[PDB]
Amino acid sequence: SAPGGKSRRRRTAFTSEQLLELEKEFHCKKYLSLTERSQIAHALKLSEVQVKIWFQNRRAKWKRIKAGNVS
């Protein structure tokens, strides 16, 4: 059963199916250089423009849980 979590701005036209590889690289390495980012982008059908903003999502995960503030 999926964990849900109703916060998601739809800002792209990718699918879980094209995303598989795009997440799979996190199991190879923690970082995707320009040459490396252009592999998956050219591996399926994706747009290196969108890849720029795809990284704007890579902070939400722990902030969902670590929803908290500073003095």
JSON list of C-alpha atoms in Angstrom, two decimals:
[
{"chain": "A", "resi": 1, "resn": "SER", "atom": "CA", "xyz": [0.00, 0.00, 0.00]},
{"chain": "A", "resi": 2, "resn": "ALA", "atom": "CA", "xyz": [1.47, 3.40, -1.03]},
{"chain": "A", "resi": 3, "resn": "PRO", "atom": "CA", "xyz": [2.44, 5.95, 1.72]},
{"chain": "A", "resi": 4, "resn": "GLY", "atom": "CA", "xyz": [0.38, 8.70, -0.09]},
{"chain": "A", "resi": 5, "resn": "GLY", "atom": "CA", "xyz": [1.27, 12.13, 1.39]},
{"chain": "A", "resi": 6, "resn": "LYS", "atom": "CA", "xyz": [-0.95, 14.79, -0.27]},
{"chain": "A", "resi": 7, "resn": "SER", "atom": "CA", "xyz": [1.53, 17.49, -1.22]},
{"chain": "A", "resi": 8, "resn": "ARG", "atom": "CA", "xyz": [2.68, 17.40, -4.89]},
{"chain": "A", "resi": 9, "resn": "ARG", "atom": "CA", "xyz": [2.86, 20.35, -7.32]},
{"chain": "A", "resi": 10, "resn": "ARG", "atom": "CA", "xyz": [2.67, 18.76, -10.82]},
{"chain": "A", "resi": 11, "resn": "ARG", "atom": "CA", "xyz": [5.59, 20.53, -12.53]},
{"chain": "A", "resi": 12, "resn": "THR", "atom": "CA", "xyz": [6.62, 17.80, -15.07]},
{"chain": "A", "resi": 13, "resn": "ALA", "atom": "CA", "xyz": [5.39, 15.32, -17.74]},
{"chain": "A", "resi": 14, "resn": "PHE", "atom": "CA", "xyz": [7.55, 12.35, -16.67]},
{"chain": "A", "resi": 15, "resn": "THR", "atom": "CA", "xyz": [6.10, 9.00, -15.40]},
{"chain": "A", "resi": 16, "resn": "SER", "atom": "CA", "xyz": [7.25, 6.50, -12.74]},
{"chain": "A", "resi": 17, "resn": "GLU", "atom": "CA", "xyz": [8.37, 4.34, -15.66]},
{"chain": "A", "resi": 18, "resn": "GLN", "atom": "CA", "xyz": [10.83, 6.91, -17.12]},
{"chain": "A", "resi": 19, "resn": "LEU", "atom": "CA", "xyz": [11.70, 7.97, -13.51]},
{"chain": "A", "resi": 20, "resn": "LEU", "atom": "CA", "xyz": [12.95, 4.48, -12.60]},
{"chain": "A", "resi": 21, "resn": "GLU", "atom": "CA", "xyz": [16.42, 5.02, -14.12]},
{"chain": "A", "resi": 22, "resn": "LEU", "atom": "CA", "xyz": [16.43, 8.67, -12.85]},
{"chain": "A", "resi": 23, "resn": "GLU", "atom": "CA", "xyz": [16.20, 7.35, -9.25]},
{"chain": "A", "resi": 24, "resn": "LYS", "atom": "CA", "xyz": [18.25, 4.16, -9.97]},
{"chain": "A", "resi": 25, "resn": "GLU", "atom": "CA", "xyz": [21.36, 6.36, -10.39]},
{"chain": "A", "resi": 26, "resn": "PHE", "atom": "CA", "xyz": [21.10, 7.22, -6.62]},
{"chain": "A", "resi": 27, "resn": "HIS", "atom": "CA", "xyz": [21.99, 3.52, -6.05]},
{"chain": "A", "resi": 28, "resn": "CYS", "atom": "CA", "xyz": [25.14, 3.94, -8.23]},
{"chain": "A", "resi": 29, "resn": "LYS", "atom": "CA", "xyz": [26.32, 7.32, -6.83]},
{"chain": "A", "resi": 30, "resn": "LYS", "atom": "CA", "xyz": [25.07, 10.24, -4.65]},
{"chain": "A", "resi": 31, "resn": "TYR", "atom": "CA", "xyz": [25.67, 12.87, -7.38]},
{"chain": "A", "resi": 32, "resn": "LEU", "atom": "CA", "xyz": [25.00, 13.33, -11.13]},
{"chain": "A", "resi": 33, "resn": "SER", "atom": "CA", "xyz": [27.53, 15.47, -13.03]},
{"chain": "A", "resi": 34, "resn": "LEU", "atom": "CA", "xyz": [26.56, 17.17, -16.35]},
{"chain": "A", "resi": 35, "resn": "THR", "atom": "CA", "xyz": [27.85, 14.21, -18.48]},
{"chain": "A", "resi": 36, "resn": "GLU", "atom": "CA", "xyz": [26.08, 11.76, -16.14]},
{"chain": "A", "resi": 37, "resn": "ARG", "atom": "CA", "xyz": [22.76, 13.70, -16.08]},
{"chain": "A", "resi": 38, "resn": "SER", "atom": "CA", "xyz": [22.74, 13.65, -19.91]},
{"chain": "A", "resi": 39, "resn": "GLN", "atom": "CA", "xyz": [22.86, 9.79, -19.86]},
{"chain": "A", "resi": 40, "resn": "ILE", "atom": "CA", "xyz": [19.31, 9.15, -18.45]},
{"chain": "A", "resi": 41, "resn": "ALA", "atom": "CA", "xyz": [17.99, 12.31, -20.19]},
{"chain": "A", "resi": 42, "resn": "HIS", "atom": "CA", "xyz": [19.08, 10.76, -23.55]},
{"chain": "A", "resi": 43, "resn": "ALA", "atom": "CA", "xyz": [18.38, 7.14, -22.38]},
{"chain": "A", "resi": 44, "resn": "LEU", "atom": "CA", "xyz": [14.62, 7.41, -22.70]},
{"chain": "A", "resi": 45, "resn": "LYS", "atom": "CA", "xyz": [12.79, 10.56, -23.98]},
{"chain": "A", "resi": 46, "resn": "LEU", "atom": "CA", "xyz": [13.43, 13.24, -21.28]},
{"chain": "A", "resi": 47, "resn": "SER", "atom": "CA", "xyz": [14.41, 16.94, -21.45]},
{"chain": "A", "resi": 48, "resn": "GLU", "atom": "CA", "xyz": [17.68, 18.16, -19.78]},
{"chain": "A", "resi": 49, "resn": "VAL", "atom": "CA", "xyz": [15.78, 21.46, -19.21]},
{"chain": "A", "resi": 50, "resn": "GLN", "atom": "CA", "xyz": [13.36, 19.64, -16.89]},
{"chain": "A", "resi": 51, "resn": "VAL", "atom": "CA", "xyz": [16.28, 17.82, -15.16]},
{"chain": "A", "resi": 52, "resn": "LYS", "atom": "CA", "xyz": [17.35, 21.30, -13.81]},
{"chain": "A", "resi": 53, "resn": "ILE", "atom": "CA", "xyz": [14.03, 21.62, -11.89]},
{"chain": "A", "resi": 54, "resn": "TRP", "atom": "CA", "xyz": [13.75, 17.88, -11.13]},
{"chain": "A", "resi": 55, "resn": "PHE", "atom": "CA", "xyz": [16.50, 18.51, -8.51]},
{"chain": "A", "resi": 56, "resn": "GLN", "atom": "CA", "xyz": [14.30, 21.25, -6.92]},
{"chain": "A", "resi": 57, "resn": "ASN", "atom": "CA", "xyz": [12.32, 18.28, -5.45]},
{"chain": "A", "resi": 58, "resn": "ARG", "atom": "CA", "xyz": [15.32, 16.45, -3.85]},
{"chain": "A", "resi": 59, "resn": "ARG", "atom": "CA", "xyz": [14.96, 18.20, -0.45]},
{"chain": "A", "resi": 60, "resn": "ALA", "atom": "CA", "xyz": [11.23, 17.60, 0.28]},
{"chain": "A", "resi": 61, "resn": "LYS", "atom": "CA", "xyz": [11.58, 13.99, 1.49]},
{"chain": "A", "resi": 62, "resn": "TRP", "atom": "CA", "xyz": [13.22, 14.56, 4.91]},
{"chain": "A", "resi": 63, "resn": "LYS", "atom": "CA", "xyz": [11.48, 17.98, 5.36]},
{"chain": "A", "resi": 64, "resn": "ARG", "atom": "CA", "xyz": [8.13, 16.13, 5.28]},
{"chain": "A", "resi": 65, "resn": "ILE", "atom": "CA", "xyz": [9.23, 14.42, 8.53]},
{"chain": "A", "resi": 66, "resn": "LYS", "atom": "CA", "xyz": [11.65, 17.15, 9.80]},
{"chain": "A", "resi": 67, "resn": "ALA", "atom": "CA", "xyz": [8.86, 19.73, 9.48]},
{"chain": "A", "resi": 68, "resn": "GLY", "atom": "CA", "xyz": [10.37, 22.10, 12.08]},
{"chain": "A", "resi": 69, "resn": "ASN", "atom": "CA", "xyz": [11.77, 25.62, 12.71]},
{"chain": "A", "resi": 70, "resn": "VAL", "atom": "CA", "xyz": [14.71, 27.63, 14.19]},
{"chain": "A", "resi": 71, "resn": "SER", "atom": "CA", "xyz": [15.02, 30.01, 17.14]}
]
